[PDB]
mmCIF file of C-alpha atoms and ligand atoms in Angstrom:
data_model
loop_
_atom_site.group_PDB
_atom_site.id
_atom_site.type_symbol
_atom_site.label_atom_id
_atom_site.label_comp_id
_atom_site.label_asym_id
_atom_site.label_seq_id
_atom_site.Cartn_x
_atom_site.Cartn_y
_atom_site.Cartn_z
ATOM 1 C CA UNK A 1 7.188 22.418 2.558
ATOM 2 C CA UNK A 2 4.371 22.670 0.037
ATOM 3 C CA UNK A 3 1.405 20.354 -0.002
ATOM 4 C CA UNK A 4 0.359 19.183 -3.445
ATOM 5 C CA UNK A 5 -3.556 19.047 -3.590
ATOM 6 C CA UNK A 6 -5.357 17.057 -6.639
ATOM 7 C CA UNK A 7 -8.664 15.605 -7.044
ATOM 8 C CA UNK A 8 -8.550 11.857 -8.038
ATOM 9 C CA UNK A 9 -10.151 10.730 -11.906
ATOM 10 C CA UNK A 10 -13.818 10.297 -11.074
ATOM 11 C CA UNK A 11 -13.453 6.235 -11.835
ATOM 12 C CA UNK A 12 -11.244 6.223 -8.912
ATOM 13 C CA UNK A 13 -13.654 7.945 -7.007
ATOM 14 C CA UNK A 14 -16.536 5.372 -8.139
ATOM 15 C CA UNK A 15 -14.022 2.697 -7.109
ATOM 16 C CA UNK A 16 -13.387 4.639 -3.647
ATOM 17 C CA UNK A 17 -16.842 5.499 -2.925
ATOM 18 C CA UNK A 18 -17.687 1.776 -3.450
ATOM 19 C CA UNK A 19 -15.000 -0.067 -1.560
ATOM 20 C CA UNK A 20 -15.600 2.281 1.476
ATOM 21 C CA UNK A 21 -19.331 1.483 1.438
ATOM 22 C CA UNK A 22 -19.149 -2.172 0.303
ATOM 23 C CA UNK A 23 -21.153 -4.700 3.408
ATOM 24 C CA UNK A 24 -17.950 -7.087 1.792
ATOM 25 C CA UNK A 25 -17.796 -9.729 4.588
ATOM 26 C CA UNK A 26 -13.656 -10.726 4.265
ATOM 27 C CA UNK A 27 -12.168 -7.821 4.634
ATOM 28 C CA UNK A 28 -9.101 -9.188 5.660
ATOM 29 C CA UNK A 29 -8.021 -9.457 2.226
ATOM 30 C CA UNK A 30 -6.436 -5.963 2.237
ATOM 31 C CA UNK A 31 -3.474 -7.746 3.466
ATOM 32 C CA UNK A 32 -2.742 -9.568 1.483
ATOM 33 C CA UNK A 33 -3.306 -7.017 -2.052
ATOM 34 C CA UNK A 34 -0.625 -4.086 -0.360
ATOM 35 C CA UNK A 35 1.614 -7.725 0.649
ATOM 36 C CA UNK A 36 1.129 -8.713 -3.535
ATOM 37 C CA UNK A 37 2.050 -5.144 -4.123
ATOM 38 C CA UNK A 38 4.760 -4.838 -1.836
ATOM 39 C CA UNK A 39 5.806 -8.385 -3.689
ATOM 40 C CA UNK A 40 5.570 -6.805 -6.981
ATOM 41 C CA UNK A 41 7.607 -3.773 -6.547
ATOM 42 C CA UNK A 42 10.327 -6.078 -4.862
ATOM 43 C CA UNK A 43 9.910 -7.552 -7.688
ATOM 44 C CA UNK A 44 10.726 -5.161 -10.104
ATOM 45 C CA UNK A 45 14.159 -3.856 -7.601
ATOM 46 C CA UNK A 46 15.337 -7.634 -8.142
ATOM 47 C CA UNK A 47 14.344 -6.995 -11.835
ATOM 48 C CA UNK A 48 16.615 -3.562 -12.290
ATOM 49 C CA UNK A 49 19.447 -4.824 -10.015
ATOM 50 C CA UNK A 50 20.116 -7.464 -12.677
ATOM 51 C CA UNK A 51 21.895 -5.513 -15.243
ATOM 52 C CA UNK A 52 22.698 -1.999 -12.528
ATOM 53 C CA UNK A 53 23.541 -3.713 -9.444
ATOM 54 C CA UNK A 54 24.382 -0.730 -7.551
ATOM 55 C CA UNK A 55 20.632 0.363 -7.912
ATOM 56 C CA UNK A 56 20.306 -2.343 -4.771
ATOM 57 C CA UNK A 57 22.133 -0.681 -2.411
ATOM 58 C CA UNK A 58 19.453 1.877 -1.193
ATOM 59 C CA UNK A 59 18.332 -0.394 0.425
ATOM 60 C CA UNK A 60 20.284 -4.143 0.781
ATOM 61 C CA UNK A 61 17.390 -6.054 2.073
ATOM 62 C CA UNK A 62 14.715 -7.611 0.221
ATOM 63 C CA UNK A 63 12.025 -7.581 2.936
ATOM 64 C CA UNK A 64 7.818 -6.854 3.654
ATOM 65 C CA UNK A 65 7.044 -5.068 7.157
ATOM 66 C CA UNK A 66 4.215 -5.328 9.083
ATOM 67 C CA UNK A 67 4.251 -2.682 12.070
ATOM 68 C CA UNK A 68 0.929 -1.379 13.847
ATOM 69 C CA UNK A 69 0.772 1.061 15.994
ATOM 70 C CA UNK A 70 -2.077 0.566 18.201
ATOM 71 C CA UNK A 71 -1.809 3.967 19.922
ATOM 72 C CA UNK A 72 -2.110 5.165 16.813
ATOM 73 C CA UNK A 73 -4.795 2.550 15.621
ATOM 74 C CA UNK A 74 -1.621 3.215 12.162
ATOM 75 C CA UNK A 75 -1.627 0.248 10.503
ATOM 76 C CA UNK A 76 2.259 0.361 8.273
ATOM 77 C CA UNK A 77 3.086 -1.782 5.313
ATOM 78 C CA UNK A 78 7.007 -1.773 4.559
ATOM 79 C CA UNK A 79 8.597 -2.199 1.619
ATOM 80 C CA UNK A 80 12.091 -2.383 0.258
ATOM 81 C CA UNK A 81 11.050 -2.638 -3.096
ATOM 82 C CA UNK A 82 11.479 0.181 -6.003
ATOM 83 C CA UNK A 83 9.351 2.656 -4.816
ATOM 84 C CA UNK A 84 7.228 4.928 -6.434
ATOM 85 C CA UNK A 85 8.486 9.096 -7.733
ATOM 86 C CA UNK A 86 6.693 11.635 -7.389
ATOM 87 C CA UNK A 87 5.217 12.338 -10.568
ATOM 88 C CA UNK A 88 3.974 7.885 -9.792
ATOM 89 C CA UNK A 89 2.200 9.589 -6.796
ATOM 90 C CA UNK A 90 0.746 12.349 -8.859
ATOM 91 C CA UNK A 91 -0.624 10.353 -11.038
ATOM 92 C CA UNK A 92 -1.672 7.121 -8.792
ATOM 93 C CA UNK A 93 -0.043 4.820 -11.059
ATOM 94 C CA UNK A 94 -2.425 5.388 -14.315
ATOM 95 C CA UNK A 95 -3.022 3.655 -17.839
ATOM 96 C CA UNK A 96 -2.720 0.591 -14.675
ATOM 97 C CA UNK A 97 -5.258 1.457 -12.946
ATOM 98 C CA UNK A 98 -7.396 3.779 -14.708
ATOM 99 C CA UNK A 99 -8.689 0.895 -17.216
ATOM 100 C CA UNK A 100 -8.387 -1.850 -14.257
ATOM 101 C CA UNK A 101 -10.952 0.288 -11.728
ATOM 102 C CA UNK A 102 -13.435 0.183 -14.735
ATOM 103 C CA UNK A 103 -13.335 -3.373 -15.834
ATOM 104 C CA UNK A 104 -13.225 -3.694 -12.225
ATOM 105 C CA UNK A 105 -16.267 -2.288 -11.817
ATOM 106 C CA UNK A 106 -17.645 -4.556 -14.386
ATOM 107 C CA UNK A 107 -16.675 -7.259 -12.280
ATOM 108 C CA UNK A 108 -18.388 -7.179 -9.876
ATOM 109 C CA UNK A 109 -21.625 -6.809 -11.885
ATOM 110 C CA UNK A 110 -21.166 -10.247 -13.620
ATOM 111 C CA UNK A 111 -21.108 -12.251 -10.208
ATOM 112 C CA UNK A 112 -16.863 -10.987 -9.502
ATOM 113 C CA UNK A 113 -15.847 -11.218 -5.382
ATOM 114 C CA UNK A 114 -14.384 -8.251 -4.577
ATOM 115 C CA UNK A 115 -11.817 -10.558 -3.573
ATOM 116 C CA UNK A 116 -10.786 -10.184 -7.719
ATOM 117 C CA UNK A 117 -9.426 -6.511 -7.000
ATOM 118 C CA UNK A 118 -6.432 -7.588 -7.294
ATOM 119 C CA UNK A 119 -6.581 -8.880 -10.966
ATOM 120 C CA UNK A 120 -7.814 -5.845 -12.561
ATOM 121 C CA UNK A 121 -4.460 -3.850 -10.918
ATOM 122 C CA UNK A 122 -6.433 -1.718 -8.436
ATOM 123 C CA UNK A 123 -5.761 -3.937 -5.680
ATOM 124 C CA UNK A 124 -4.090 -1.023 -3.869
ATOM 125 C CA UNK A 125 -7.696 0.223 -2.635
ATOM 126 C CA UNK A 126 -9.353 -2.474 -1.493
ATOM 127 C CA UNK A 127 -7.515 -0.764 1.846
ATOM 128 C CA UNK A 128 -10.946 1.839 1.928
ATOM 129 C CA UNK A 129 -12.569 -1.840 3.447
ATOM 130 C CA UNK A 130 -10.388 -0.602 6.413
ATOM 131 C CA UNK A 131 -9.249 2.327 7.111
ATOM 132 C CA UNK A 132 -10.617 5.317 5.869
ATOM 133 C CA UNK A 133 -7.726 7.257 5.800
ATOM 134 C CA UNK A 134 -4.448 6.276 3.863
ATOM 135 C CA UNK A 135 -0.558 8.062 3.590
ATOM 136 C CA UNK A 136 2.388 6.204 0.906
ATOM 137 C CA UNK A 137 5.704 6.534 1.828
ATOM 138 C CA UNK A 138 7.971 6.488 -1.068
ATOM 139 C CA UNK A 139 11.403 6.353 -2.227
ATOM 140 C CA UNK A 140 11.879 6.237 -5.736
ATOM 141 C CA UNK A 141 16.245 5.504 -5.754
ATOM 142 C CA UNK A 142 15.183 8.796 -9.503
ATOM 143 C CA UNK A 143 13.153 10.797 -6.598
ATOM 144 C CA UNK A 144 13.472 12.746 -3.004
ATOM 145 C CA UNK A 145 10.965 10.435 -0.463
ATOM 146 C CA UNK A 146 7.500 12.056 -0.515
ATOM 147 C CA UNK A 147 3.940 11.421 1.347
ATOM 148 C CA UNK A 148 0.859 10.815 -0.871
ATOM 149 C CA UNK A 149 -2.260 10.965 1.853
ATOM 150 C CA UNK A 150 -6.073 10.602 0.884
ATOM 151 C CA UNK A 151 -8.335 11.445 3.771
ATOM 152 C CA UNK A 152 -10.967 9.799 0.292
ATOM 153 C CA UNK A 153 -13.523 12.080 -0.524
ATOM 154 C CA UNK A 154 -12.342 13.307 -4.776
ATOM 155 C CA UNK A 155 -8.699 14.565 -3.160
ATOM 156 C CA UNK A 156 -4.980 14.049 -2.148
ATOM 157 C CA UNK A 157 -1.704 15.663 -1.972
ATOM 158 C CA UNK A 158 1.498 14.937 -2.126
ATOM 159 C CA UNK A 159 4.391 16.798 0.383
ATOM 160 C CA UNK A 160 8.917 16.571 -0.111
ATOM 161 C CA UNK A 161 8.388 14.197 2.801
ATOM 162 C CA UNK A 162 11.183 16.590 5.670
ATOM 163 C CA UNK A 163 9.952 14.544 8.558
ATOM 164 C CA UNK A 164 9.850 10.588 8.404
ATOM 165 C CA UNK A 165 11.834 8.596 9.250
ATOM 166 C CA UNK A 166 14.145 7.775 6.023
ATOM 167 C CA UNK A 167 12.864 4.562 3.973
ATOM 168 C CA UNK A 168 15.877 4.229 1.489
ATOM 169 C CA UNK A 169 14.379 2.896 -1.220
ATOM 170 C CA UNK A 170 10.612 1.657 -1.004
ATOM 171 C CA UNK A 171 7.347 2.467 0.144
ATOM 172 C CA UNK A 172 5.673 2.822 3.435
ATOM 173 C CA UNK A 173 1.796 2.480 3.789
ATOM 174 C CA UNK A 174 0.160 4.133 6.468
ATOM 175 C CA UNK A 175 -3.605 2.782 6.878
ATOM 176 C CA UNK A 176 -5.246 4.485 9.729
ATOM 177 C CA UNK A 177 -7.519 1.741 10.700
ATOM 178 C CA UNK A 178 -11.620 2.376 11.077
ATOM 179 C CA UNK A 179 -12.995 1.583 14.958
ATOM 180 C CA UNK A 180 -14.405 -1.357 13.682
ATOM 181 C CA UNK A 181 -11.163 -2.078 12.381
ATOM 182 C CA UNK A 182 -9.065 -2.495 15.226
ATOM 183 C CA UNK A 183 -8.662 -6.208 15.346
ATOM 184 C CA UNK A 184 -5.271 -5.496 12.306
ATOM 185 C CA UNK A 185 -3.592 -4.419 14.924
ATOM 186 C CA UNK A 186 -3.712 -7.752 16.926
ATOM 187 C CA UNK A 187 -0.058 -9.837 16.972
ATOM 188 C CA UNK A 188 -1.784 -13.635 16.721
ATOM 189 C CA UNK A 189 -4.754 -11.783 13.344
ATOM 190 C CA UNK A 190 -2.479 -9.891 11.050
ATOM 191 C CA UNK A 191 -0.857 -13.502 11.411
ATOM 192 C CA UNK A 192 -3.517 -15.626 11.213
ATOM 193 C CA UNK A 193 -4.137 -13.285 7.307
ATOM 194 C CA UNK A 194 -0.988 -13.773 6.157
ATOM 195 C CA UNK A 195 -1.098 -17.454 7.257
ATOM 196 C CA UNK A 196 -3.527 -17.538 5.439
ATOM 197 C CA UNK A 197 -3.542 -16.191 2.072
ATOM 198 C CA UNK A 198 -0.031 -15.177 1.736
ATOM 199 C CA UNK A 199 1.505 -18.079 2.600
ATOM 200 C CA UNK A 200 3.950 -17.911 -0.659
ATOM 201 C CA UNK A 201 5.431 -15.324 -1.120
ATOM 202 C CA UNK A 202 9.196 -15.145 -2.798
ATOM 203 C CA UNK A 203 10.159 -12.408 0.451
ATOM 204 C CA UNK A 204 10.162 -12.694 4.351
ATOM 205 C CA UNK A 205 7.336 -10.865 5.878
ATOM 206 C CA UNK A 206 8.884 -9.532 9.454
ATOM 207 C CA UNK A 207 6.310 -8.106 12.522
ATOM 208 C CA UNK A 208 7.131 -5.787 15.163
ATOM 209 C CA UNK A 209 5.676 -6.820 18.019
ATOM 210 C CA UNK A 210 5.766 -3.661 20.258
ATOM 211 C CA UNK A 211 6.120 -4.462 24.249
ATOM 212 C CA UNK A 212 2.106 -3.104 25.594
ATOM 213 C CA UNK A 213 1.897 -0.628 28.030
HETATM 214 N N1 LIG B 301 3.981 -0.513 -1.545
HETATM 215 C C1 LIG B 301 4.203 0.074 -3.344
HETATM 216 N N2 LIG B 301 4.948 -0.413 -3.245
HETATM 217 C C2 LIG B 301 4.720 0.121 -5.446
HETATM 218 S S1 LIG B 301 6.591 0.286 -5.967
HETATM 219 C C3 LIG B 301 5.314 0.623 -7.622
HETATM 220 C C4 LIG B 301 6.231 1.315 -9.530
HETATM 221 O O1 LIG B 301 5.348 0.204 -10.362
HETATM 222 N N3 LIG B 301 7.269 1.568 -9.232
HETATM 223 C C5 LIG B 301 7.576 2.393 -11.140
HETATM 224 C C6 LIG B 301 8.679 3.254 -10.593
HETATM 225 C C7 LIG B 301 8.650 3.736 -12.215
HETATM 226 N N4 LIG B 301 8.097 4.570 -12.600
HETATM 227 C C8 LIG B 301 8.289 5.703 -13.023
HETATM 228 C C9 LIG B 301 8.505 7.209 -13.007
HETATM 229 O O2 LIG B 301 9.284 6.994 -11.565
HETATM 230 C C10 LIG B 301 8.421 8.180 -13.366
HETATM 231 N N5 LIG B 301 9.497 9.088 -13.337
HETATM 232 C C11 LIG B 301 10.034 9.323 -14.557
HETATM 233 N N6 LIG B 301 10.709 10.453 -13.877
HETATM 234 C C12 LIG B 301 10.313 11.092 -12.731
HETATM 235 N N7 LIG B 301 9.138 10.182 -12.664
HETATM 236 C C13 LIG B 301 10.567 6.474 -13.746
HETATM 237 C C14 LIG B 301 11.702 6.602 -13.066
HETATM 238 C C15 LIG B 301 12.902 6.667 -13.910
HETATM 239 C C16 LIG B 301 12.882 6.451 -15.181
HETATM 240 F F1 LIG B 301 14.455 5.975 -15.363
HETATM 241 C C17 LIG B 301 11.877 6.134 -15.692
HETATM 242 C C18 LIG B 301 9.932 6.148 -15.520
HETATM 243 F F2 LIG B 301 9.333 6.341 -16.583
HETATM 244 C C19 LIG B 301 7.223 3.602 -12.987
HETATM 245 C C20 LIG B 301 6.044 3.949 -11.075
HETATM 246 C C21 LIG B 301 4.439 0.538 -7.411
HETATM 247 C C22 LIG B 301 3.982 0.188 -6.229
HETATM 248 N N8 LIG B 301 2.695 -0.008 -5.125
HETATM 249 C C23 LIG B 301 1.731 0.322 -6.420
HETATM 250 C C24 LIG B 301 1.124 -0.775 -6.826
HETATM 251 C C25 LIG B 301 -0.641 -1.113 -7.206
HETATM 252 C C26 LIG B 301 -0.699 1.190 -6.644
HETATM 253 C C27 LIG B 301 -0.870 1.703 -6.719
HETATM 254 C C28 LIG B 301 0.681 1.351 -6.277
HETATM 255 N N9 LIG B 301 -1.164 2.884 -6.618
HETATM 256 C C29 LIG B 301 -1.101 3.893 -6.321
HETATM 257 C C30 LIG B 301 -0.125 4.864 -6.821
HETATM 258 C C31 LIG B 301 -0.288 5.959 -5.450
HETATM 259 C C32 LIG B 301 -0.253 6.385 -4.590
HETATM 260 C C33 LIG B 301 -1.149 5.463 -4.008
HETATM 261 C C34 LIG B 301 -1.429 4.657 -3.899
HETATM 262 C C35 LIG B 301 -2.783 2.461 -7.711
HETATM 263 C C36 LIG B 301 -3.137 1.690 -7.387
HETATM 264 O O3 LIG B 301 -2.393 0.759 -7.843
HETATM 265 C C37 LIG B 301 3.264 -0.324 -3.792
HETATM 266 O O4 LIG B 301 1.559 -0.437 -3.996
#
């Protein structure tokens, strides 16, 4: 019932201004990066299941699901991966991301493409290419379901989730797309991006199409 507010590190805040203001074309790579993150989180629960199969029981299916919400201008990406606890969310997965954000920005100056972002472990922030506002709903076996949210601007919130559909286990990103990026709500377009950049993913990718009004 309480919204906890936190401030991003200066380096994450710097990475976020760069991405929000980048003139970079090929902005579609955000979807590869989020699918790759979903795949990695799924690999983790697969791995844990080797020694503790019961950890899978909170959500027995291993999947990635993409759900355009045209009415809300929101693209959701959901996985049944291992999830994030409150502490993980509050810390924006620090250290794994802290160091990468600074390296990624140095790599850019030395000629790297923005498409290399994921090689620095911070591909998550590529969503700012196409969205200015994002919710991260997540459920880890060892914590409750939480919602992390940011409109950028150097701050984010983390709130216990009492309103959303239960994930069981895993994470759902909700991207509030920018007005010029609404093509990523279209079934045709999403299938192209997935086929071009994520053809070899080790998990079924489900796309939800909703009968239009
Ligand atoms: N769709 C996604 N799915 C998952 S799943 C996962 C994971 O590693 N999860 C593990 C789960 C375990 N945890 C440790 C802990 O939870 C700590 N703890 C301890 N006691 C309470 N808490 C724990 C639990 C039990 C235990 F016994 C011991 C433990 F230490 C470390 C993180 C990560 C992700 N990312 C992602 C990728 C890359 C990212 C990001 C996300 N960023 C991000 C983070 C939060 C909000 C917004 C963006 C930052 C940029 O880079 C996704 O997108």
